[PDB]
């Protein structure tokens, strides 16, 4: 028996190394600065030199239109070698060209009470599907006045923060030169591109890096709720298109196929309650999915070699990049339970048999004491989100109140707004929560101390 | 037994997620963009373009006009259809006129110590009902130098930070055009409307949104202590005066109507301890409350009504803001406490009958045990209060002092302040405090340890 | 034995509301923002119009002289009634005179390495009685070149955050008018009054509001180490000087007289361990000694009187609010304690002798078990004072290093400047604290748990 | 056995404070603000006067040049005795001449994809031994634009943030005078200095001050990673290099002999499990280094005599201050550990034999417990440095993600950008954590709870 467990010990042991060797192999080091720079060269800056807003601030439609004719035309253009081609901080490749697109809702697409009927001329609606215009507006001379299709435009449809958005909409290509792009965003100014009816905007672009070998992914997307006002919101993704350069590339590549006879030899074994079962299930069902995704997802690379031929279009990586993103997402989360099916051999064979007893024994017990304070955790988020909410950005959704619940118990907290909130139920709220929470679980030990 | 606390659990059961899609129902999604659209434009605006300070900032009568005259006007006006009517963002109107209202004290309303006679002039007290000022100051023009009565002048007396104010004072309503309202605000600062004895103003206005159906009214509320200085505030509330748009509206309506019927239901049940007759009692009475307003208070809607006539006058939704912001508290009190209704039944008889034999069985020993640590929690409090709140606004007021432990204990801390008020107990007081809680509460696990 | 009790404990009852009264009673209630105005107009304002420092920000003698010729002097004058007579926002009399004071520090105080004498012409030494500069140096015309003594000089040696400083020095009384107090400052600076010896300076005035009757004392205070550089500190006091206006003041008076004979009659039980005797007996020494101080130290009043005699002078009231405060400091501790002294009595007969049983009962043991963790709690603050201390400020002083350590365990962190100090121990001193703090105390519960 | 026991009892006793003396007085107390202004003077200040960035902000070589002919010449210089020589706040010598050294990589270290090689002209590897670029680029006038080695110029090689950077490469010394400096700067950015491939500079002075005798040595330490930007770091360390000047300085000397005799005399009780033989040992080794360190590494002080035979060079303190600090480190472990030592004799003797037989007890048995959550907190940092570290500079290095979730545990947060990374696994991230963690100890409780 021990040497069969051994076997599937070392067996899990090699697989360890492996999984985090292409994890560590497939993550480069310096990565993040390459992001923190784009990010505070663009998010960070001021909008106008005599401007003291960021991006991050932008309140306004005119608060746009300065941030596009603003920092950045100056933070994708530089001199600088074409002269066409401009490298961001002399170091990057501004790759292919900037893509605008908006999206934009039709005018009856709401309705007006009869009383203000005669006072107000028209609404716009909070944005959808239904409530999509596709009307060809303004001077109807290009992409930016003419509907396209998700379907006719090649793109993904992304999920905002409000709102998921589908790809179609308005767009618009830019120049490979600042000036052209500039004369193009005027006329965007002089005729109106953004109206009544604008709920969203996005600025998309990707930038390529010579030193270390990867491609940043800018998508700048901006909301117009019907309230009015300005949602930035922005991604900075970098990813790896190339796989091959180095031989310790070709060195990783030779493991992942390595790699995939692992998993091979598992899906075998998972054939037949259990609990590690249930665990090691989870741990196979991801592993498949990463590289369904890792091959006939992403390995395609069509849109590179696509653009590779023809450079002055717009190179799309919105999927390759939504996806690697999920690859990354998932990929993580395997290491973590990696690490977790550890347990269950080398510590429960010799250390945690001492503990396991103990533990597996009051994990079903847990379970029934656990019960009671969610319910009241979550109604104090029930309770905060309809207090709150309309009030404090912590509150504003549902589920970030639950999270902003647990800064509070953890000590973060922006005690001020709240009383600024609610002069009254606010602290109450917040007495009581914090109150109520040591009080709660102190009885949970002693039904616990029961045993 | 069970299927009559079956029948008693069901119909619980339908009564919560009525409630819940009350709730869900009476609250919009994105309402909060909308109020933080309003805010940032205001609160958070520069006064001046030349001006580094925010509404929020405002230390003197001189940044008070300068905010006024500045980008209050700005914030209030847009170009933009009638042209008399400024939709704000181009999105909202500004929905009738605004008012400014302020209150004033009489001269001789406090007394000069006799040494310093000889040197003072004059004082003004404190605001209160008797110090407040009825006379006709100034030019006795207009209603800004013309005192009227809160029963005259229709509102309702609203308490401050410092202090409750009667609606009745010294109150102008403002123009329909931007610059009209300069010449208005001008000649009020031309002539001194703001003088010594002035304690506190309001500016109040309302805002409509044709997007969403919803209305924003705002009151800006300024205090000048007799100290001197300024103490900003503000209120932005939304509100649903229009019930009936959308069928989905007209859904919820019958809905409310089948609520009554629940409340009529249980209210029959209530007649005959006990804990939960106690608990059940709280459920009833704060339900027919929300009714009682959401009808012959809320369900007014004269004053709209009364607006729609004629849009040039004021049109005063303090009380509608005022009370639906109250049903709104209550409501949210409900749900929560509808929430905790849960316990009684689905846990007790199965999962918590081994756990509220040691919850209800301890919770009358908690009293005795919790006594201990709240004394000298409000100990440390009540000193707190002495040795500060003369230097840190933590510890302003005796109440906020309690909330700053908590922010304490939780970790939330500006210690620096603390230590510039007094080098010495401050440190001292903070790191007793902290000290002996943690100690206090050790000790009170032992004596639960008893049993 | 009951009634017995009782008697002594109605007593004790009476006793405290008649101490909370006076409490209540002699702290009025919206002084706070009486401070807070004063130092936002004077702390938190721009040095210079075109200057983004405030009075916190100074780091040189230019810094200085730009606050000394700027805010300050603004701060101090208003037009407006004398016109001599400038009201602080209007509504505060400037009281008297303001005043100037510093200290300077001999030549050869300090000694140079043999081997640079031939480089340095001269040093001078870190501030002392010793090298206290008594030169008349300067053009020896004024008060400002010409030294005085504490004697001579009505003051009190005053405790600063480097280091304590003697009440003499070179000082000079300001002007009336702000006019003439620039013409006196400009020669101060145009002269140079600020050389490489000068250590400290004073910036003392009162400030009287008429609204409510209290005073205000400033004390400015900067420091100029013998490294260079300012260490600007600052102090606001509210003083109560004449104690009768309203008949409520009054009240009070017979109540402070009645409150003397309490504690006439506690002295007497006092004659004759124990732990209450030891608490006792704490409350009754603190109470002569504010009493003594409410006396025969603030109730003469004389500078007052004196100053009112000619108000041209400047009202030194430093001893006045020095003492006061410490008065307020010991008054409060006093109620702290005396809400101690309810324990031993309503709580031991009934609810707690089934708690002080094990209270008092573990209270011995729990010295023993407190031992550990303070000797190593203190090791880190030892460690951490040696490896911090020249970088971080909150680990400036060994007394702060310990402050700090209880903001790191309840969570008040500033990590970012911790590893910029060091890159290596800090974070290892930050885990392992951090780290063995849990676990040390968990230990302790066993030991405790063996009971 | 007690009188043995009392023996080496009161000689650690003695040994105690005698170090704690050398502490003490190797410590110098107002250290703290001497660093703090010179800090605040350089770090602090605005790059340019119309500029809003302080030497922390920079984010580009322009950034960089404008610091250069910035703050730091105007930092650097003051008027002032030469005047050849310039007191900085007239208080500190500027020591000998600032230099400024460079690091530069090769062309061709990197290898661009064969797709974009007829894009791209040339790329520039990240830094390393190999990528140096010791060819001899630009007008190759001066050591600016020739190559040195670290061998030849004085020099140790430094562990930078990204990198070690070996102290050769390319450098250059500054002058006496401010403006004499400008002009070799300007030469330095008129010819290009910084050009694609600079990695890393540095900037290292050294000043001295004569009021109290310490010497500070400045290295400001900017690099470029390849991926462009600006990664700024400094270092500001005081140095006493002149043991002697008081007789207090004296007095200490013979301790640090005397202290030598103690270490010697403990040495030998060394000779012959146990742990605290283990823990002794480690007292000793560190005893030892610490003075080999303090004789044969510092008590050189060539340098510092060889710089004060001519003042106009460049006295390299690098090693000089690189060992103090060492010194500085391990010193202060050991006095923690000394500290340690108590425990062992006059607590188990009497009040821990209570103690230490629970403590030593279950000390075995922890480590058996604490398995468990590591591996788990492991788990998380390693998840979190996968799914963030691209995005958090509190992620950005795996060491880092560990000591982020202890500011997390402890309550330092900043979550709005955690959630700006991740919309979806951050918030699960982060609850989770949180959640298990709790979760987690509360059990091992139980299984001590066993005993
Ligand atoms: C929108 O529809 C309303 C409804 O008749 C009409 O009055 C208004 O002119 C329309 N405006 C636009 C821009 O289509
Ligand atoms: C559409 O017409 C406007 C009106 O002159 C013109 O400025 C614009 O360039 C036209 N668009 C295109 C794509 O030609
Ligand atoms: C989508 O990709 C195809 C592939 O050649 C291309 O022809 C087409 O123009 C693209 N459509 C876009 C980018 O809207
Ligand atoms: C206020 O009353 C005092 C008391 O006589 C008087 O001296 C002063 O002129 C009055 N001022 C005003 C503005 O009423
Ligand atoms: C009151 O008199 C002043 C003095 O000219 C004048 O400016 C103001 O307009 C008058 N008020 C009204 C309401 O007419
Ligand atoms: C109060 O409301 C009535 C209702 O018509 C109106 O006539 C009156 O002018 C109002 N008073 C105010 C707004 O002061
Ligand atoms: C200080 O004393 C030194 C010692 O001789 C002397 O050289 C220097 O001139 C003196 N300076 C002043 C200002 O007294
Ligand atoms: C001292 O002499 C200077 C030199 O002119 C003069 O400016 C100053 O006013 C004099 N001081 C006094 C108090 O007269
Ligand atoms: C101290 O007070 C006495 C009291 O009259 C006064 O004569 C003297 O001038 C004062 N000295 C000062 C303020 O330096
Ligand atoms: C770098 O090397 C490439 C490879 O041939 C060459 O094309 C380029 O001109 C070189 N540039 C420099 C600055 O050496
Ligand atoms: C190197 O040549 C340039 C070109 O004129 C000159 O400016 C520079 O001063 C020279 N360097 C030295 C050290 O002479
Ligand atoms: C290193 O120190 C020696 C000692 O005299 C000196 O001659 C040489 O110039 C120095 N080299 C440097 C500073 O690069």
Same mark, same amino acid.
């Given at each position: 028996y021990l040497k069969s467990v051994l076997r599937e010990l070392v067996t899990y042991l090699l697989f360890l190394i492996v999984l985090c060797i292409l994890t560590y192999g497939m993550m480069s080091s310096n990565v993040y600065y390459y992001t923190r720079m784009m990010s505070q060269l663009?998010?960070?800056? %001021?909008? +106008?030199? !005599?401007? $003291? /807003?960021?991006?991050?601030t932008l309140s306004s439609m005119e608060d746009f239109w300065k941030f596009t004719e603003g920092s950045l035309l100056d933070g994708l *253009?530089?001199?600088?070698?074409?002269?066409?081609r401009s490298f961001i901080f002399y170091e990057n490749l501004l790759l292919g060209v900037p893509r605008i697109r908006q999206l934009r809702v039709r005018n009856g697409s709401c309705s007006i009470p009869q009383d203000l009927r005669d006072e107000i001329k028209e609404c716009y609606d909070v944005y959808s599907v239904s409530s999509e215009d596709r009307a060809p507006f303004? %001077?109807?001379?290009?992409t930016a006045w003419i509907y396209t299709s998700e379907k006719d435009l090649n793109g993904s449809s992304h999920w905002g923060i409000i709102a998921t958005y589908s790809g179609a909409g308005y767009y618009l290509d830019l120049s490979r030169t600042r000036e052209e792009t500039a004369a193009q965003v005027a006329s965007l100014k002089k005729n109106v591109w953004?109206?009544?009816? /604008?709920r969203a905007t996005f600025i998309d672009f990707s930038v390529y890096n010579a030193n270390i070998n990867l491609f940043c992914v800018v998508r700048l997307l901006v909301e117009f709720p019907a309230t009015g006002g300005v949602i930035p919101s922005w991604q900075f993704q970098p990813l $790896?298109?190339?796989? *091959? @350069?180095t031989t310790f590339d070709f060195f990783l590549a030779a493991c992942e196929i390595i790699f995939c006879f692992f998993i091979f030899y598992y899906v075998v074994e998972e054939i037949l309650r259990s609990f590690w079962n249930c665990l090691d299930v989870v741990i196979v069902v991801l592993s498949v999915v990463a590289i369904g995704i890792n091959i006939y997802? !992403? +390995?395609? @690379?069509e849109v590179l070699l696509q653009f590779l031929?023809?450079?002055?279009?717009? %190179?799309?990586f919105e999927h390759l990049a939504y996806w690697q993103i999920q690859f990354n997402n998932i990929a993580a989360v395997t290491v973590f339970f990696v690490w977790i $099916?550890?347990?269950?051999?080398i510590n429960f064979?010799? !250390?945690?048999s001492q503990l396991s007893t103990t533990m597996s024994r009051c994990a079903k017990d847990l379970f029934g004491f656990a019960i009671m304070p969610f319910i009241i955790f979550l109604a104090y988020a029930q309770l905060a989100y309809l207090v709150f909410g309309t009030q404090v950005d912590d509150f504003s959704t549902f589920q970030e109140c639950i999270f902003t619940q647990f800064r509070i118990i953890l000590?973060?907290?922006?005690?001020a707004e709240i009383e600024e909130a609610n002069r009254v139920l606010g602290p109450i709220y917040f007495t009581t929560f914090v109150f109520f929470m040591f009080f709660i679980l102190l009885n949970m030990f002693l039904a616990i101390i029961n045993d």
């Open positions: 663009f998010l960070d800056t %001021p909008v +106008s030199k !005599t401007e $003291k /807003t960021n991006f991050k *253009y530089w001199k600088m070698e074409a002269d066409n303004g %001077p109807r001379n290009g953004l109206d009544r009816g /604008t $790896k298109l190339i796989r *091959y @350069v997802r !992403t +390995s395609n @690379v031929e023809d450079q002055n279009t717009f %190179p799309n $099916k550890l347990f269950k051999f064979n010799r !250390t945690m000590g973060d907290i922006n005690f």
